[PDB]
Design an enzyme around this catalytic site. Structure first.
Site, PDB file in Angstrom:
ATOM      1  N   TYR A  86       0.954  -1.141  -0.049  1.00 55.82           N
ATOM      2  CA  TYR A  86       0.025  -0.192   0.011  1.00 55.82           C
ATOM      3  C   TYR A  86       0.802   1.417  -0.101  1.00 55.82           C
ATOM      4  CZ  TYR A  86      -4.363  -2.684   0.958  1.00 55.82           C
ATOM      5  OH  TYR A  86      -5.245  -3.635   0.758  1.00 55.82           O
ATOM      6  N   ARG A  88       1.641 -10.898  -5.757  1.00 56.78           N
ATOM      7  CA  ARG A  88       1.089  -9.415  -5.566  1.00 56.78           C
ATOM      8  C   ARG A  88       2.011  -8.821  -6.747  1.00 56.78           C
ATOM      9  NH1 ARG A  88       1.580  -5.823  -0.125  1.00 56.78           N
ATOM     10  NH2 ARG A  88      -0.863  -7.056  -0.163  1.00 56.78           N
ATOM     11  N   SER A 129       7.637   4.836   5.053  1.00 58.42           N
ATOM     12  CA  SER A 129       6.617   3.917   5.536  1.00 58.42           C
ATOM     13  C   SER A 129       5.983   5.034   6.648  1.00 58.42           C
ATOM     14  CB  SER A 129       7.376   2.704   6.532  1.00 58.42           C
ATOM     15  OG  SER A 129       7.936   3.031   7.532  1.00 58.42           O
ATOM     16  N   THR A 130       4.683   4.428   6.741  1.00 60.68           N
ATOM     17  CA  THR A 130       3.904   5.399   7.528  1.00 60.68           C
ATOM     18  C   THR A 130       4.329   5.177   9.082  1.00 60.68           C
ATOM     19  OG1 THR A 130       2.459   3.482   8.251  1.00 60.68           O
ATOM     20  CG2 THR A 130       1.877   4.965   6.133  1.00 60.68           C
ATOM     21  N   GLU A 172       6.203   8.342   4.760  1.00 62.21           N
ATOM     22  CA  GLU A 172       4.839   8.749   3.838  1.00 62.21           C
ATOM     23  C   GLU A 172       3.844   8.853   4.623  1.00 62.21           C
ATOM     24  OE1 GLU A 172       4.783   8.990   0.570  1.00 62.21           O
ATOM     25  OE2 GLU A 172       2.889   9.381   0.985  1.00 62.21           O
ATOM     26  N   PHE A 173       3.103  10.194   4.109  1.00 61.68           N
ATOM     27  CA  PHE A 173       1.772  10.613   4.936  1.00 61.68           C
ATOM     28  C   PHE A 173       0.468  10.402   4.286  1.00 61.68           C
ATOM     29  CE2 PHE A 173       5.104  14.030   5.754  1.00 61.68           C
ATOM     30  CZ  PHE A 173       5.396  13.742   7.057  1.00 61.68           C
ATOM     31  N   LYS A 187       7.087  11.973  12.402  1.00 62.06           N
ATOM     32  CA  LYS A 187       6.094  11.100  11.706  1.00 62.06           C
ATOM     33  C   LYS A 187       5.503  10.261  12.955  1.00 62.06           C
ATOM     34  CE  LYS A 187       3.764   9.371   8.259  1.00 62.06           C
ATOM     35  NZ  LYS A 187       2.857   8.346   8.970  1.00 62.06           N
ATOM     36  N   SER A 221     -16.642   7.454  15.714  1.00 61.98           N
ATOM     37  CA  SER A 221     -16.895   6.006  14.849  1.00 61.98           C
ATOM     38  C   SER A 221     -16.806   4.811  15.840  1.00 61.98           C
ATOM     39  CB  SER A 221     -15.733   5.805  13.797  1.00 61.98           C
ATOM     40  OG  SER A 221     -14.419   5.804  14.489  1.00 61.98           O
ATOM     41  N   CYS A 280      -1.322   1.797  10.965  1.00 56.16           N
ATOM     42  CA  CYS A 280      -0.692   2.604  11.398  1.00 56.16           C
ATOM     43  C   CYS A 280      -0.883   3.343  12.883  1.00 56.16           C
ATOM     44  CB  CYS A 280      -0.355   3.773  10.546  1.00 56.16           C
ATOM     45  SG  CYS A 280       0.257   5.463  11.055  1.00 56.16           S
ATOM     46  N   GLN A 295      -2.548   2.082  15.874  1.00 52.94           N
ATOM     47  CA  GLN A 295      -2.429   1.430  16.916  1.00 52.94           C
ATOM     48  C   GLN A 295      -1.011   0.897  17.017  1.00 52.94           C
ATOM     49  OE1 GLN A 295      -5.148  -1.748  18.815  1.00 52.94           O
ATOM     50  NE2 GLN A 295      -3.582  -3.050  18.052  1.00 52.94           N
ATOM     51  N   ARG A 316      -6.511  -4.537   7.828  1.00 57.05           N
ATOM     52  CA  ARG A 316      -5.574  -4.561   8.999  1.00 57.05           C
ATOM     53  C   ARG A 316      -6.124  -3.732  10.087  1.00 57.05           C
ATOM     54  NH1 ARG A 316       0.081  -3.245   5.821  1.00 57.05           N
ATOM     55  NH2 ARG A 316      -1.530  -1.998   4.606  1.00 57.05           N
TER      56      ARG A 316
HETATM   57  O1  UDX Z   1      11.752  -8.998   3.392  1.00 53.10           O
HETATM   58  C1  UDX Z   1      10.594  -8.338   2.733  1.00 53.10           C
HETATM   59  C2  UDX Z   1       9.488  -8.015   3.705  1.00 53.10           C
HETATM   60  C3  UDX Z   1       8.408  -7.542   2.960  1.00 53.10           C
HETATM   61  N1  UDX Z   1       8.300  -7.460   1.622  1.00 53.10           N
HETATM   62  C4  UDX Z   1       7.137  -6.881   1.111  1.00 53.10           C
HETATM   63  O2  UDX Z   1       6.826  -5.462   1.559  1.00 53.10           O
HETATM   64  C5  UDX Z   1       5.631  -5.406   1.413  1.00 53.10           C
HETATM   65  C6  UDX Z   1       4.628  -4.772   2.641  1.00 53.10           C
HETATM   66  O3  UDX Z   1       3.536  -4.115   2.085  1.00 53.10           O
HETATM   67  P1  UDX Z   1       2.246  -4.077   3.034  1.00 53.10           P
HETATM   68  O4  UDX Z   1       1.268  -3.629   2.224  1.00 53.10           O
HETATM   69  O5  UDX Z   1       2.273  -4.977   3.985  1.00 53.10           O
HETATM   70  O6  UDX Z   1       2.614  -2.611   3.956  1.00 53.10           O
HETATM   71  P2  UDX Z   1       2.229  -0.987   3.816  1.00 53.10           P
HETATM   72  O7  UDX Z   1       2.785  -0.748   2.470  1.00 53.10           O
HETATM   73  O8  UDX Z   1       0.816  -0.981   3.923  1.00 53.10           O
HETATM   74  O9  UDX Z   1       3.139  -0.229   4.785  1.00 53.10           O
HETATM   75  C7  UDX Z   1       2.584   0.161   6.162  1.00 53.10           C
HETATM   76  O10 UDX Z   1       1.965  -0.889   6.828  1.00 53.10           O
HETATM   77  C8  UDX Z   1       3.014  -1.851   7.405  1.00 53.10           C
HETATM   78  C9  UDX Z   1       4.013  -1.237   8.422  1.00 53.10           C
HETATM   79  O11 UDX Z   1       4.703  -1.870   8.896  1.00 53.10           O
HETATM   80  C10 UDX Z   1       4.656  -0.153   7.491  1.00 53.10           C
HETATM   81  O12 UDX Z   1       5.530   0.635   8.201  1.00 53.10           O
HETATM   82  C11 UDX Z   1       3.591   0.859   6.702  1.00 53.10           C
HETATM   83  O13 UDX Z   1       4.339   1.697   5.974  1.00 53.10           O
HETATM   84  C12 UDX Z   1       4.673  -6.661   0.987  1.00 53.10           C
HETATM   85  O14 UDX Z   1       4.186  -6.971  -0.274  1.00 53.10           O
HETATM   86  C13 UDX Z   1       5.997  -7.584   1.197  1.00 53.10           C
HETATM   87  O15 UDX Z   1       5.787  -8.714   0.305  1.00 53.10           O
HETATM   88  C14 UDX Z   1       9.216  -7.588   0.693  1.00 53.10           C
HETATM   89  O16 UDX Z   1       9.406  -7.485  -0.522  1.00 53.10           O
HETATM   90  N2  UDX Z   1      10.371  -8.239   1.441  1.00 53.10           N
HETATM   91  O1  UDX Z   2     -12.623  11.222  11.542  1.00 55.34           O
HETATM   92  C1  UDX Z   2     -12.026  10.118  11.452  1.00 55.34           C
HETATM   93  C2  UDX Z   2     -10.918   9.826  10.660  1.00 55.34           C
HETATM   94  C3  UDX Z   2     -10.491   8.554  10.770  1.00 55.34           C
HETATM   95  N1  UDX Z   2     -11.047   7.634  11.418  1.00 55.34           N
HETATM   96  C4  UDX Z   2     -10.864   6.147  11.312  1.00 55.34           C
HETATM   97  O2  UDX Z   2      -9.226   6.184  11.719  1.00 55.34           O
HETATM   98  C5  UDX Z   2      -8.507   5.265  10.774  1.00 55.34           C
HETATM   99  C6  UDX Z   2      -7.400   5.799   9.946  1.00 55.34           C
HETATM  100  O3  UDX Z   2      -8.068   6.486   9.040  1.00 55.34           O
HETATM  101  P1  UDX Z   2      -6.837   7.216   7.929  1.00 55.34           P
HETATM  102  O4  UDX Z   2      -7.933   7.807   6.745  1.00 55.34           O
HETATM  103  O5  UDX Z   2      -6.034   7.996   8.572  1.00 55.34           O
HETATM  104  O6  UDX Z   2      -6.144   6.099   7.238  1.00 55.34           O
HETATM  105  P2  UDX Z   2      -4.586   5.391   7.197  1.00 55.34           P
HETATM  106  O7  UDX Z   2      -4.298   4.652   8.286  1.00 55.34           O
HETATM  107  O8  UDX Z   2      -4.675   4.881   5.719  1.00 55.34           O
HETATM  108  O9  UDX Z   2      -3.756   6.753   7.391  1.00 55.34           O
HETATM  109  C7  UDX Z   2      -3.189   7.011   8.553  1.00 55.34           C
HETATM  110  O10 UDX Z   2      -1.927   6.397   8.588  1.00 55.34           O
HETATM  111  C8  UDX Z   2      -0.914   6.356   7.867  1.00 55.34           C
HETATM  112  C9  UDX Z   2      -0.346   7.776   7.833  1.00 55.34           C
HETATM  113  O11 UDX Z   2       0.427   8.099   6.745  1.00 55.34           O
HETATM  114  C10 UDX Z   2      -1.637   8.731   7.400  1.00 55.34           C
HETATM  115  O12 UDX Z   2      -1.109  10.257   7.353  1.00 55.34           O
HETATM  116  C11 UDX Z   2      -2.778   8.596   8.361  1.00 55.34           C
HETATM  117  O13 UDX Z   2      -3.951   9.259   8.214  1.00 55.34           O
HETATM  118  C12 UDX Z   2      -9.631   4.631   9.909  1.00 55.34           C
HETATM  119  O14 UDX Z   2     -10.203   3.391  10.398  1.00 55.34           O
HETATM  120  C13 UDX Z   2     -10.884   5.708   9.910  1.00 55.34           C
HETATM  121  O15 UDX Z   2     -12.170   5.264   9.999  1.00 55.34           O
HETATM  122  C14 UDX Z   2     -12.326   7.930  12.162  1.00 55.34           C
HETATM  123  O16 UDX Z   2     -12.789   7.115  12.881  1.00 55.34           O
HETATM  124  N2  UDX Z   2     -12.627   9.053  12.315  1.00 55.34           N
END
Ligand code: UDX
Ligand code: UDX
Ligand code: UDX
Ligand code: UDX
Ligand code: UDX
Ligand code: UDX
Ligand code: CL
Ligand code: CL
Lengths: 461, 459, 164
Positions: free
Chosen positions: A14, A41, A130-131, A161-162, A220, A269, A276, A278, A346
């Protein structure tokens, strides 16, 4: 002093996937290669059906894939060729050992660092993205410092990444600010400016913040805390509104008009989900243990405790309305993603609400327009016999509501407010309950009550 | 019905400026501010106002005697008023149930009884304060039990969002106006009449209307969100001190997120003022009656963190002086809880002073607007003050021969001091403890002089 | 460099007997013990010493007036000495942070400042006690912040292992 013309990104999830797609779309002269250990993937990224659902992501990928944007399982070669290497892999929480259930497991980031050293000669810029960057840059630098080679010169940058899922394309194209961290040395300055020049293809310079790697990661960490705290704070207010006869939506409107507070992230909610927030709170708590800052850990721990309380209270209201007995009762669960416009589940509140209902023996019928059926089974089967006896995955909302006692909306999918609720009410058992955990049926309570529903929503009586 | 005469019980930081701006914007409305404090009322009618507020003197003198009046005649002001504001203070109970947490509504109850005694016909009674804790309900209970023939009193809720030091600018251009009233034909008529007053200078889209309880709950929540921003950025400042980052640079990266906002992210020794701490304590006590312990302990952390921030700052001062401060002169620059005001209520300067006094420090306190008598009362228990506390006339007398200079209030004059002159007369090593980040950008100059500069959120 | 004049701030159970033995073993070195308690200083110059130590009466009277001296003039003794001993007492704090546990360094701090007030040139400042708690750091922080031209103060730690 140095220009990036080729980019590799370890991690096609993601974060890495969308980020590189936008970079490749904004910088047609830069070759961008997204690599991943997950072949299925990677094959999906090269297919008409992407491995993640993101609004607008399909149009971005297909605009430049095969031209300057590439997806591959060849991690080693992508590294060799690269001027810049992104590290966008996940960091799961330790399931055992010191820091069990709180500390981050940096084994994947460490493995990336050694892999990089293995396939690198000359000058490369390694950037962690990463987030939730939990001491990631330091861990990469320590491996690089200990594995030196003649003419090998690796740099380590931090670039959190934001983006938020569901709006990643919009967030990446028009970010509020770009954060880049690097060493306060001539080497680090050269690396930072080189990465800045990439973003300067579509991001104004005044929105690009430069600092050192630790201050970058700490910022971050703090930013995600503030966002999650806003949700838990407005959710604490939703408990007060339920107990005193007010509406949290009206209160949140009066709060948000204070320009010092802002009107964003004030939507009560069932509870925040996602990979991110928790995780960030837990990482902060463990970091404070190593720093001997228990007052700071105690302060931010309440963001998690309030979130767990909000979920339990919502599940209790469902069980309470059903005579505190839900054995063999059909309940519809509308929405399983942690937010709308994504298939990601997640830490979704839908998992926790379902498990609370399954502990009562409820027959759950779950519908979500984007979450794959196998993902729901894995989420509920997490340590299945109980899932086999109680869980059913529906193909449409009317099927999940047919013969149900209650309808539980856990995700703010816009399609849920356009459903035929007269048809749902006819084939539901009486009394028929609708539990809006997202306030998506606001403005429809008069119609739903006239039809004959019992409407229970968060933050209102 | 047109509101043409306004009376306000309470000539303090809320009622005084609020009525001055109303009369300033509504030349055809007579506004009478009443108060039991005769010396305070006399000050309002003197060239030296009782409170310090930028622009307040120009607003008062532009309409005082025309349509703005200050008096101790509470009875006749009530009798002639169409709209009656109640803007008194509600102190925290010092004994009994809720000691230290619950609010004491005796003054609001006393105002409601006095209004009935001097009222006939139709009036609108509006509660206006920064911390409205169950005020409209208690006023309603007294009116419903003390009725006269043809007496029709309407109760409204109208919380005041101003901040001291910027009250005039806030009142002239508020972010929003929140008005609560009954969901009845009478309540809506009363609310509409109050909206017509603000419409003289406030746009309609910025006037929110609801019921009285939702009005008070919104204000309470809003205060909680504000104080929480300060405690959160203060918790980050402890994190910055322990890891080598700058909380000012961290707050910059946070505030650029438009979902977060770049306001109220200034780390400090701790928040003060009559509003926030009390508001949190009232939230805690309210949750005890409603059986919401999870909500109570959530917001309790806003106070616990603020107390930790204060204690950590005092400990850094004591630690820098070899853990012994007996008979050591220390200068305290700034005693108000924020700049551009003389108010000292719950100021961190009080707590930092008491922590240093408990170690035997000889404090020399300077503040440009806080009167010396207020500082003596603040530090005195309801002996140490006579032995350890000196009130200075100028900053250079307080720093003369001191070991450390402690900046507790962000007065703009503190960044313009001659610190070469201060360093020469200080004992070495000379410490500067910037509790407000006011000397940022001057560290290189201060280090060259010879200072040991210690500030919040930075080493 | 050779040490020929020694001053000791503190004429108690530590500084007293230590300097009496130093003066007895180093006859070419002038040893001056100073103290703020005049009654204690007078006793050191009297036939009745203020403390009872077996054999101390013989050691002191063997060199008192020759190269061992007891005086209340703290300022001039520091001004002439090449080595300045600090053997003062560090009581436990009776209030504040660390009440009942933490040592009170106000006397050591006053000695360090008074040394700077009456010192020019090169001097070696040595803290001697049986319970030295961050004494050398406290003295060094004061000397580094109160420097003068051609003023070179050295800070040494020399704990005393004697048992009364
Ligand atoms: O050794 C490794 C580990 C992981 N990976 C890949 O890295 C990718 C991770 O993508 P994910 O969708 O799980 O994660 P995100 O991009 O959403 O990152 C987010 O969620 C997980 C948090 O720990 C990260 O810090 C946050 O950026 C996976 O596709 C996995 O296959 C590798 O290619 N090699
Ligand atoms: O007003 C709100 C906003 C958000 N939420 C909940 O909080 C959770 C997080 O929502 P976000 O849109 O922030 O989703 P994300 O987890 O993708 O992004 C978050 O983590 C990664 C960071 O880089 C982003 O900047 C941060 O927003 C969701 O389950 C959402 O439903 C609420 O319950 N109320
Ligand atoms: O019975 C009374 C009590 C009080 N008063 C007057 O009301 C005035 C209150 O002014 P203060 O400056 O104390 O109060 P503020 O305007 O700052 O109000 C703010 O702080 C105190 C909180 O309890 C209030 O809720 C908040 O609005 C005083 O001048 C007092 O004399 C009366 O006229 N009658
Ligand atoms: O960024 C910040 C802001 C504020 N503070 C501190 O927080 C304390 C309160 O400052 P404010 O400007 O909020 O002052 P006030 O108490 O006058 O106003 C506050 O209470 C009354 C409400 O109506 C106002 O909306 C609210 O701002 C001050 O001690 C200030 O120094 C910080 O330490 N950092
Ligand atoms: O500022 C000062 C303090 C103290 N002094 C003198 O230092 C002398 C100390 O006498 P004490 O008998 O207490 O000293 P001692 O030699 O027994 O020291 C021993 O006991 C106390 C502990 O704290 C010391 O660390 C230990 O060495 C006193 O005569 C006092 O007058 C000064 O001259 N100036
Ligand atoms: O076997 C023993 C020895 C000693 N003790 C007691 O322990 C106490 C200390 O006796 P010491 O002779 O060690 O007394 P002092 O305090 O003079 O010397 C002690 O502190 C200063 C250090 O420099 C010395 O090295 C240390 O011995 C006495 O009260 C003695 O009675 C016992 O009870 N039993
Ligand atoms: Cl079961
Ligand atoms: Cl004292």
């Amino acid at each position: 002093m140095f220009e990036i013309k080729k980019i590799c990104c370890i991690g096609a999830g993601y974060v890495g996937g969308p980020t590189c797609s936008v970079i490749a779309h904004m910088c047609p002269e830069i070759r961008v290669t997204v690599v991943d250990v997950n072949e299925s993937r990677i094959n999906a990224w090269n297919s008409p059906t992407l491995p993640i659902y993101e609004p607008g992501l399909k149009e971005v990928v297909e605009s430049c894939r095969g031209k300057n944007l590439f997806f591959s399982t060849n991690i080693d070669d992508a590294i060799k060729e690269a001027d810049l290497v992104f590290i966008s892999v996940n960091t799961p929480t330790k399931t055992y050992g010191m820091g069990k259930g709180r500390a981050a497991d940096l084994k994947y980031i460490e493995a990336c660092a050694r892999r990089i050293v293995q396939n690198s000669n000359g000058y490369k810029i390694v950037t962690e993205k990463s987030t939730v960057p939990v001491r990631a840059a330091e861990s990469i630098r320590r491996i690089f410092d200990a594995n030196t080679k003649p003419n090998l010169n690796l740099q380590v940058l931090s670039n959190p990444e934001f983006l938020a899922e569901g709006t990643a394309i919009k967030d990446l194209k028009n970010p509020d600010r770009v954060l880049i961290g690097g060493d306060e040395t001539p080497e680090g300055q050269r690396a930072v400016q080189a990465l800045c020049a990439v973003y300067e293809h579509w991001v104004p310079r005044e929105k690009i913040l430069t600092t050192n790697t630790w201050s970058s990661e700490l910022s971050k960490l703090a930013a995600n805390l503030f966002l999650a705290q806003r949700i838990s704070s407005i959710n604490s207010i939703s408990a007060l509104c339920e107990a005193t006869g007010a509406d949290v939506e009206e209160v949140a409107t009066a709060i948000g008009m204070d320009q010092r507070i802002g009107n964003k992230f004030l939507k009560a909610s069932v509870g925040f989900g996602g990979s991110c927030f928790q995780k960030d709170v837990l990482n902060l708590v463990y970091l404070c243990e190593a720093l001997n800052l228990p007052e700071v850990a105690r302060y931010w721990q309440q963001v998690i405790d309030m979130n767990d309380y909000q979920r339990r209270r919502f599940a209790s209201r469902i069980i309470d309305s059903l005579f505190n007995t839900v054995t063999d009762k059909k309940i519809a669960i509308l929405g399983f993603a942690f937010k709308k416009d994504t298939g990601d589940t997640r830490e979704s509140s839908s998992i926790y609400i379902s498990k609370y209902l399954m502990d009562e023996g409820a027959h759950l019928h779950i519908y979500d327009p984007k979450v794959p059926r196998e993902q729901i089974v894995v989420d509920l089967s997490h340590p299945d016999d109980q899932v086999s006896r109680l869980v059913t995955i529906s193909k449409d909302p009317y099927e999940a509501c047919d013969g149900a006692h209650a309808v539980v909306i856990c995700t703010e999918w816009d399609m849920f407010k356009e459903l035929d609720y007269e048809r749902i009410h006819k084939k539901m058992l009486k009394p028929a309950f609708i539990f809006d955990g997202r306030r998506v049926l606001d403005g429809l309570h008069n119609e739903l009550q006239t039809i004959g529903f019992q409407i229970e929503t968060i933050g209102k009586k």
